[PDB]
């Protein structure tokens, strides 16, 4: 069986289940937390569960942890513009922290789905190319068109071997 | 092994499959240097026909000659493929009948 407690944390499904996609300004996220103290249990479970999801969804964001450095847990986001956002995560459960960070710095679902539609714009149904990039390789695959010779031989008239013979 | 240990050690590595007597090739061209017989290891008893051939790669090997009877004399060119003769230790090749100077087995 998968090693480690909560092995589900190491499944691509769990990583993709994250919902916190940071806006383009967020560049660094420092999570300070305390390994002990009941008031930091939310931060502990956040670091243990969600940080994988956040990092997976925002790969270029530098997430760095700091253990027992301050009497309270907190997150600090350094944004590209030079702004610093401090989030006090004491007394909040990990789910509350996720909701809060999504609300204050997470892309909205409208933006996410608009970006997905933009990506859909790239692949055009009518384009003909390799299976990796297009639905169909050749117009021969469209019913009603002249089928591929490798399957249905063309009439002797329509093949150059016999057009030349007729011309001769 | 712990997750950290596995991550440190990376995925397991397969040693490059050591090439057999054919140097990883279906067949080789050889010149019959000599012909003789070998007693198979016990309990099998026989006089297996073998020939020392200098392969195209410059190596000198022993090829077992299959079939009932042969005419492989010195200097004749033969084709040799893999497949060890089980009862002969070290004879790890076989002359392909009907190719080059090794005619098929007479009925």
């Amino acid at each position: 069986p998968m090693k480690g407690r909560f092995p589900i944390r190491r499944t691509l499904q769990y990583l993709s289940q994250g919902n916190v996609v940071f806006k383009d300004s967020v560049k660094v996220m420092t999570v300070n937390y305390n390994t002990h103290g009941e008031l930091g249990e939310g931060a502990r479970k956040f670091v243990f569960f969600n940080i994988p999801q956040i990092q997976y969804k925002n790969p270029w964001v530098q997430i760095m942890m700091f253990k027992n450095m301050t009497p309270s847990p907190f997150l600090r986001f350094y944004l590209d513009s030079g702004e610093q956002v401090l989030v006090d995560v004491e007394t909040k459960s990990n789910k509350e922290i996720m909701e809060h960070i999504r609300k204050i710095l997470g892309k909205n679902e409208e933006t996410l789905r608009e970006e997905e539609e933009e990506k859909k714009q790239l692949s055009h149904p009518a384009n003909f190319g390799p299976r990796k990039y297009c639905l169909r390789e050749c117009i021969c695959e469209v019913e009603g068109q002249v089928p591929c010779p490798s399957l249905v031989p063309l009439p002797k008239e329509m093949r150059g071997k016999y057009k030349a013979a007729l011309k001769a | 092994a712990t997750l950290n240990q596995m991550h440190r050690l990376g995925p397991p590595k397969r040693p490059p499959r050591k090439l057999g007597p054919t140097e990883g090739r279906p067949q080789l061209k050889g010149v019959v240097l000599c012909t003789f017989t070998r007693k198979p290891k016990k309990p099998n008893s026989a006089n297996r026909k073998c020939c020392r051939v200098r392969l195209s790669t410059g190596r000198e090997a022993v090829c077992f000659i299959p079939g009932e009877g042969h005419t492989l004399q010195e200097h004749q060119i033969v084709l040799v493929e893999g497949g060890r003769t089980q009862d002969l230790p070290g004879v790890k090749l076989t002359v392909v009948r009907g190719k080059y100077d090794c005619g098929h087995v007479q009925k």
Partner: protein, 109 residues
Amino acid sequence: SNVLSVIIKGDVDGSVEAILNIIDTYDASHECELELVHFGVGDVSANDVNLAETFDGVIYGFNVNAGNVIQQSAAKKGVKIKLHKIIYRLVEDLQEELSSRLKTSWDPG
């Protein structure tokens, strides 16, 4: 033993056949044996050199060339290449080699 292994390389198939007939007219096998490892048409090739090395043979090239690469390989492997443009000159050289192995009793006629 007193055995001479010979590779024959000729410019044309007729020349190769003539040299082969001259060889077959050998009759002094008792005092020294003559073995024909390989005969062919064309310039001395790496295969010919390899056969010569394998059987301690001598390459006799009748109206054929042996590039500098072939000469270097022959020197490296101890093979001896003998390029002759005349049939009787080549036969004389062959007789000399037979005697060196021993003069040879075989008379080409």
